[PDB]
Design a protein around this ligand. Structure first.
Ligand SMILES: CCNC(=O)Nc1cc(-n2cc(Br)cn2)c(C(=O)Nc2cccnc2)cn1
Length: 187
């Protein structure tokens, strides 16, 4: 399944050779946080372009569920990240690495994937007084060509739009490569 997406990435994510698909990856992750905002449980989304060719999307929602199915021994989070609004599992499949961190029920949970394949089970990594979900991913350089870096104005245009289409949600955009920051929120 993840193999399928890796074989024909352009079908799932858009053109892989001109930056379209690259940016669609970010928007799919953001759409999941927006859905949590539409459900009334997320007030702020922070999108960060890091200086190591990754993007992170952090929300202050309920957190992705962290329970385990007792007979399968697989977490809900893993199911969400690995099984086929094209969906975050596609993003995962087309990422050399993806990091999920969930803050929920007083605990921090984390899992790492490479090309969609989990590296270890979802694990507890601390305690927290906050809630929400963070996805950070490093796009596959076997998939994307020509435009392999995130472009601030593409994200800024669309995040601004998302903030006015979902009035009340605060969307912050941050670029670690030059300190640029924007705050999109509409009343
Ligand atoms: C950075 C990307 N952000 C992001 O994915 N945020 C999310 C996603 C959520 N979920 C989407 C699914 Br399918 C399952 N959880 C949920 C969610 O629905 N959590 C939830 C709801 C009800 C009971 N337990 C957990 C919350 N935030």
């Amino acid at each position: 399944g993840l193999d399928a997406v890796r074989k024909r990435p352009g079908m799932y994510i858009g053109d892989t050779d001109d930056g379209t698909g690259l940016h669609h990856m970010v928007f799919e992750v953001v759409d999941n946080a927006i859905d949590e905002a539409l459900a009334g449980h997320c007030k702020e989304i922070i999108v960060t372009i890091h200086a190591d060719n990754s993007v992170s999307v952090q929300d202050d929602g309920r957190g992705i569920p962290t329970g385990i199915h007792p007979e399968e021994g697989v977490s809900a989070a893993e199911v969400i990240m690995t099984v086929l609004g094209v969906g975050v599992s596609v993003v995962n499949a087309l990422s050399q690495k993806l990091e999920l961190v969930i803050q929920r029920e007083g605990k921090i949970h984390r899992q790492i994937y490479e090309h969609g394949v989990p590296q270890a089970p979802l694990a507890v990594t601390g305690e927290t007084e906050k809630t929400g979900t963070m996805v950070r991913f490093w796009p596959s350089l076997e998939t994307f060509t020509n435009v392999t870096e995130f472009e601030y104005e593409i994200l800024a245009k669309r995040l601004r739009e998302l903030s006015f289409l979902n009035s009340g949600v605060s969307i912050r955009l941050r670029d670690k490569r030059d300190g640029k920051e924007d705050h999109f929120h509409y009343e």
